[PDB]
Ligand binder design. Structure first.
Ligand SMILES: *[C@@H]1O[C@H](CO)[C@@H](O[C@@H]2O[C@H](CO)[C@@H](O)[C@H](O)[C@H]2NC(C)=O)[C@H](O)[C@H]1NC(C)=O
Ligand SMILES: *[C@@H]1O[C@H](CO)[C@@H](O[C@@H]2O[C@H](CO)[C@@H](O)[C@H](O)[C@H]2NC(C)=O)[C@H](O)[C@H]1NC(C)=O
Ligand SMILES: *[C@@H]1O[C@H](CO)[C@@H](O[C@@H]2O[C@H](CO)[C@@H](O)[C@H](O)[C@H]2NC(C)=O)[C@H](O)[C@H]1NC(C)=O
Ligand SMILES: *[C@@H]1O[C@H](CO)[C@@H](O)[C@H](O)[C@H]1NC(C)=O
Ligand SMILES: *[C@@H]1O[C@H](CO)[C@@H](O)[C@H](O)[C@H]1NC(C)=O
Ligand SMILES: *[C@@H]1O[C@H](CO)[C@@H](O)[C@H](O)[C@H]1NC(C)=O
Ligand SMILES: *[C@@H]1O[C@H](CO)[C@@H](O)[C@H](O)[C@H]1NC(C)=O
Ligand SMILES: *[C@@H]1O[C@H](CO)[C@@H](O)[C@H](O)[C@H]1NC(C)=O
Ligand SMILES: *[C@@H]1O[C@H](CO)[C@@H](O)[C@H](O)[C@H]1NC(C)=O
Ligand SMILES: *[C@@H]1O[C@H](CO)[C@@H](O)[C@H](O)[C@H]1NC(C)=O
Ligand SMILES: *[C@@H]1O[C@H](CO)[C@@H](O)[C@H](O)[C@H]1NC(C)=O
Ligand SMILES: *[C@@H]1O[C@H](CO)[C@@H](O)[C@H](O)[C@H]1NC(C)=O
Ligand SMILES: *[C@@H]1O[C@H](CO)[C@@H](O)[C@H](O)[C@H]1NC(C)=O
Ligand SMILES: *[C@@H]1O[C@H](CO)[C@@H](O)[C@H](O)[C@H]1NC(C)=O
Ligand SMILES: *[C@@H]1O[C@H](CO)[C@@H](O)[C@H](O)[C@H]1NC(C)=O
Lengths: 170, 316, 316, 170, 316, 170
């Protein structure tokens, strides 16, 4: 997509992540773990469901028969009707095709951006205590125990309390 | 040492189309074009009249097959292939227009026209309208001359519409097998009939001659109609050949008319119908029948148009 | 110590709809569907003809109410409910087609057909066309037989169109109250009229009989028409029952025709009209009247569709 | 929106900012002040007005009467006309609804991005003399007087002239 | 010391329109509206029948100009301005409907109706249908009375349709110059003709009188038609004035019909045609002719709509 | 566009870059040179061509004549036909205009983002060995010979091998 995260600087998705759409995978002295981010996941789900709510409906507009399947209407009027119906079919087939392609383009990009927004959120939380890997990872100078990792996930991580030791490892 | 951000994925996605790409795989997708038909007329909660062997135009004239439909009331009217408008062979002028009126009528109420007759017969019947022996259209009168070859006098009959809604008036014209049968029925000579209301002017001279034996009979009856407005009057000048309306029809309200060959079902509800059944769906489009009627998804030519409901699938 | 970036906001935004969201509040928004009507026909700068009591088809035949409209010129033509096409009760065959022609005609110019008559009367009149005493349609001639019950001879009349634009030709057919009144007027027997031009063939036998007393009269006049091409000739064979055209009509240019019940106003300009008035707007859509005509915003079913003109509103 | 600034990492908008769409709010030894950015504001206004110019018009295409309100046309042709008109109404009602929703989505995102573009402009001006707060703020190491703040606003701020003192405060 | 990222550009871009901007310059762009016409009918690979002087309806009746088109087969049928349906002046009732049927017929196959006649002539001819001396419509028979002023007896003729596709039946009605010429041809008195099939009822009394000399002749022949269904029978009652069908037409398959004034060309292939030629294009829209037919780009009012195929142009 | 790179923080395009859509222009002790990035260029070309493939086609739907240019149909039916055709023309003229404007907006933005994605890729490769100029340039502390520059272009550049010397030049 446009934001270059999904099928971009992030190599690929995780098939083990069954908990949400987006998430964190850490690696420290205590080992590897993976957890789903609710906020980002929910923001994408809510936008996608809002699209569906908009699209999944027919109108209250009634149309009646203007021709006859058991007793053919006069040929001239019948041909005008068929021409008109076919013309209308052509408009709706176009509308339907264009609507779906446009929506799908936006849905994919929308998901791409939510991934990027999560990425930039964390970068900002970590401040000068970390550096970008380039593959969708943040190498952390100071020692993050499983507690530390959970503080980052839950938006409570205080950068100033590990700054000097991380800075000293420049 | 490190913390990594990622997103979910599957081994195998669902292909969808975008502005830039055909067949891009996404995590999840859903259909926007309805293809599931229900092979019944889903009429739960609706006053339904299935005409069966009664033709819809026959509800106005009343051949024996339509005896139980002379004053029907309905939200939904179903025409069947086996329907017939006639007993004595014949057809209506401006027939499809009249079917369209009756389809959305809400059904019909009938009222006596109030015609009396002096100097002629009024009880012409036939073998093709069977009610235990010969009969005729229940709402019509076949006017003849008193006796064989007798002069059918020139006649002037009125009906005023004293109600607040337009009255549907129907009358016929007979076409005997011979030119000699026209003389026996109504006396010899050229017969003229005319009709005049505030916004209507038309005239009909008969046309005898042999026709194919339909229902074993080679005669034909023309059927004619107009909408007589409230407080308007309609006049019939006639020398013969003429089938007189006994009752007038008034439209009840609103309905929807369909043609179909499948069974009624009061267990399902639907508002989109076609000859093969009912389209029940919340999807915006359908690819079942371009002539579906009611409140329907829009017909499109494509069988399927998948809408992405997940991110792009980028597996390991 | 610090510098912060931000954006403006209000305590209370304007709700709009997006692809993903119903009722998201934005800083500012504007309407795309026009709902404001002007209850006048805004005709500033346009040659306007308000027909009033004159029926549009009456401009071709000329009943007294249409005397001042026999050769009108116009960019805009207004039909009124009180309009009447006839003085002597009657109606036109193919009437709506003819109204459509006349609505965009630019008005009409009239020219003598050049008919002379020998062996018949030409000055038939009536009580229902009042010009201080009895009269008749100003552009037409009621042809009778010299005297009561006299033989109306078989007649052959031509008119060539020597101009470069098609000529509208109109003629009538009379329907007397009685079958005996047809004999008094044009002599007894079946009367035939026929018409033939390069691409036209039609014939009309009359049809006497009683009709409701319209304007106190129970007779009717049929009215008929065709477009005679440049250098084409048109022939009228007739034995009676026939109302002869005195003048032919030629169309002037271009116009727009409307039906309406509100006043003309030369103080406002508009190009989109409906019966209730004028839609003056630059907006792309309107929800006032689906049958509006001229150069109009597209009719939509929604009353309102707000377009964001500011960022999303994210207050404190 | 897609760029995650408005109703994103910036908590909320300023109701006191009546001067433009976007702006700077500073805080130093001389106190707090707020000023509107013309360039960003104008770029968004110009794009939005360009949308309006495109959309606010009807066509020069004339349509005439094909039926009659005072004298009903024949029923069959009348029903064909009504069916055709209703079909057309259905197309335009759809077009209008989809147009407005699509435009509004783009308008909101367009405003979001302009906010982000201003944010990234300033980040780039400040170089290594500042660090990201995460709420839409740049904490500045060296001392910016009201003159200093105006240099940033007006695109004249020279990072090299305050670098060492800001760097030394790492 | 430094590495810089950039993008390509030109001194001068191509202007395109966006949602926010008119006339933004981009690196490259391409046209979406087709304006290039090919001034030929491109018919490579198609069975083509160019009717030339033969009128399309004349293929059913067979005036001399249509002698080589009585049983044509085609994928593409071309009507020309010089085409004429008639030799003896006349026209068809419901003509455009019939042209529409024949345009997509795939052409026609002809079959003997099987009519025999006793007590009348069958070989009426004229000066206007020239096949080295007088003649008549190749598929029709002009029925007269045995001799001048003789009684044309009342007649009853049938044709059953034993094939599996509908039979097109055509018959005529003659309109002599005089009322006296009608008596010479078929005997004096009012003549009646009627037609009756399962879903058809109509009657035609003639109408003599003088008409303009077309082809030097002032008589006219009416032409009439219906589609007789498989296993259906059609009856003709007649006292005169009647032009009898000799053969019936059956439709072959499928075709496309066009009207045009340009040459056929078997060197180019196309599927979108208009009177001025062929639109060959892969573009989604065209601004050549709103009445183009076949499989065409959609007609739009704009002459040009450029689609960006490169980034925005931001030169030095 | 939305991503603020093309006609944004990058002042202008290069007219000398005839090799691709995007590229690098370096400046070192060995002099200046310029080279095209294949990957970014190709990604934009492929998306644009995919749009064309979608759009450049008419349908297999056949329409026949319903009126007559040599022999005018009856006026009433003729006017209904003309009204219907004009109504359809109005829908397609709108569809065509809106399609092209929407596509062009997306095409321009799509190209803008690809430029930005290349910019961010390189920033991430260089790590702490460089700093952002602000005009679309990365000033490099350590000494990049033409070999060095080619390693950046070809995605092989190892930041750790020049880190200290670049860091020391802070
Ligand atoms: C208008 O189109 C309808 C179909 O939408 C045509 O009716 C079909 O005709 C085909 C071929 O004869 C039959 O196989 C089908 O049974 C018909 N379907 C229906 C629903 O009627 C119809 O002939 C067309 N009208 C005209 C005048 O050509
Ligand atoms: C076509 O629709 C029009 C309305 O758009 C119908 O006319 C209306 O009919 C209702 C109910 O009788 C009246 O209340 C209105 O006064 C009518 N409005 C107008 C503008 O005429 C019309 O009946 C429909 N045509 C057919 C054949 O059903
Ligand atoms: C329907 O529109 C067509 C044009 O699309 C009209 O026909 C044209 O009429 C003008 C003015 O008389 C002529 O200059 C052209 O030669 C005609 N073009 C074609 C292709 O026929 C036609 O008159 C309209 N129909 C009605 C009933 O008004
Ligand atoms: C993916 O894998 C196989 C086809 O290779 C099939 O069984 C399965 O249904 C596929 N799933 C999806 C969602 O396409
Ligand atoms: C995927 O989409 C379908 C709609 O077809 C929906 O019902 C279902 O809940 C979705 N499945 C998952 C796992 O999200
Ligand atoms: C029909 O009506 C007449 C009344 O004049 C009567 O004489 C005759 O018997 C009736 N015929 C039948 C079969 O009812
Ligand atoms: C019809 O006439 C009656 C009086 O007999 C009156 O009450 C009613 O309002 C009239 N209706 C109309 C439509 O004029
Ligand atoms: C917002 O506040 C109140 C409603 O609570 C109302 O008076 C005012 O008009 C509202 N303004 C807008 C723009 O919605
Ligand atoms: C808000 O939009 C309206 C259009 O309805 C416009 O006239 C007005 O200038 C705008 N107001 C402000 C404060 O921008
Ligand atoms: C009508 O015309 C005839 C001419 O033959 C004349 O005798 C008669 O008086 C006229 N009648 C009137 C009322 O003008
Ligand atoms: C009509 O005939 C005249 C000669 O009298 C000629 O000048 C004119 O061009 C002709 N018009 C047409 C349309 O053929
Ligand atoms: C640009 O320059 C000139 C017009 O000033 C012209 O010769 C050339 O064709 C132009 N090229 C494009 C692509 O517009
Ligand atoms: C520009 O677009 C055209 C389509 O009109 C295409 O054929 C051509 O290859 C393109 N030119 C360049 C230099 O990309
Ligand atoms: C026409 O047919 C009749 C057969 O009764 C015959 O007598 C007559 O000579 C024929 N005339 C011509 C010109 O063939
Ligand atoms: C017509 O009748 C024949 C028997 O003569 C039969 O084979 C055929 O199926 C019938 N066709 C139809 C449509 O009923």
């Amino acid at each position: 997509g446009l934001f270059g995260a999904i099928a971009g600087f992030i190599e690929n998705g995780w098939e083990g992540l069954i908990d949400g759409w987006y998430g964190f995978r850490h690696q420290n002295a205590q080992g590897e773990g993976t957890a789903a981010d609710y906020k980002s996941t929910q923001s994408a789900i809510d936008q996608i469901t809002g699209k569906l709510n908009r699209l999944i409906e027919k109108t209250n507009q009634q149309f009646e028969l203007i021709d006859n399947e058991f007793n053919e209407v006069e040929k001239q009027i019948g041909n005008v009707i068929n021409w008109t119906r076919d013309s209308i079919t052509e408009v709706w087939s176009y509308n339907a095709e264009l609507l779906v392609a446009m929506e799908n383009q936006h849905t994919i990009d929308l998901a791409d951006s939510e991934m990027d927004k999560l990425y930039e959120r964390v970068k900002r939380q970590l401040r000068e205590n970390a550096e970008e890997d380039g593959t969708g990872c943040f190498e952390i100078f100071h020692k993050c125990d499983d507690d530390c990792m959970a503080s980052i996930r839950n938006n409570t991580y205080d950068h100033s309390k590990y700054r000097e030791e991380a800075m000293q490892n420049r | 040492d490190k913390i990594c951000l990622g997103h979910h994925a599957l081994s195998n996605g669902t292909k969808v189309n975008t502005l830039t790409e055909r067949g891009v795989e996404v995590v999840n997708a859903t259909e926007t074009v309805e293809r599931t038909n229900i092979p019944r007329i889903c009429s739960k909660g609706k006053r339904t009249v299935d005409l069966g062997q009664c033709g819809l135009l026959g509800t106005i004239t009343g051949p024996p097959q339509c005896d139980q439909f002379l004053e029907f009331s309905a939200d939904l009217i179903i025409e069947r292939r086996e329907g017939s408008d006639v007993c004595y062979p014949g057809k209506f002028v401006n027939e499809e227009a009249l079917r369209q009126i009756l389809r959305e009528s809400g059904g019909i109420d009938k009222e006596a026209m109030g015609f009396t007759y002096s100097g002629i017969r009024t009880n012409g019947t036939t073998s093709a309208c069977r009610r235990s022996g010969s009969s005729f259209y229940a709402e019509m009168k076949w006017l003849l001359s008193n006796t064989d070859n007798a002069a059918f006098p020139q006649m002037t009959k009125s009906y005023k519409n004293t109600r607040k809604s337009p009255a549907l008036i129907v009358w016929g014209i007979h076409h005997s097998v011979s030119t000699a049968e026209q003389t026996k029925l109504y006396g010899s000579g050229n017969k003229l009939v005319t009709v005049g209301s505030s916004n209507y002017q038309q005239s009909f001279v008969p046309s005898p001659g042999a026709r194919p034996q339909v229902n074993g009979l080679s005669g034909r009856i023309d059927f004619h109609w107009l909408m007589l407005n409230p407080n308007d009057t309609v006049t019939f000048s006639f020398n013969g050949a003429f089938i007189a309306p006994d009752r007038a029809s008034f439209l009840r309200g609103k309905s929807m008319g369909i043609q179909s060959g499948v069974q009624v079902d009061a267990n399902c509800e639907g508002d989109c119908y076609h000859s093969g059944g009912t389209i029940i769906s919340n999807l915006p489009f359908q690819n079942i029948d371009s002539r579906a009627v009611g409140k329907c998804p829009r017909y499109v030519k494509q069988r399927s148009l998948l809408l992405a409901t997940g991110m792009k699938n980028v597996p390991e």
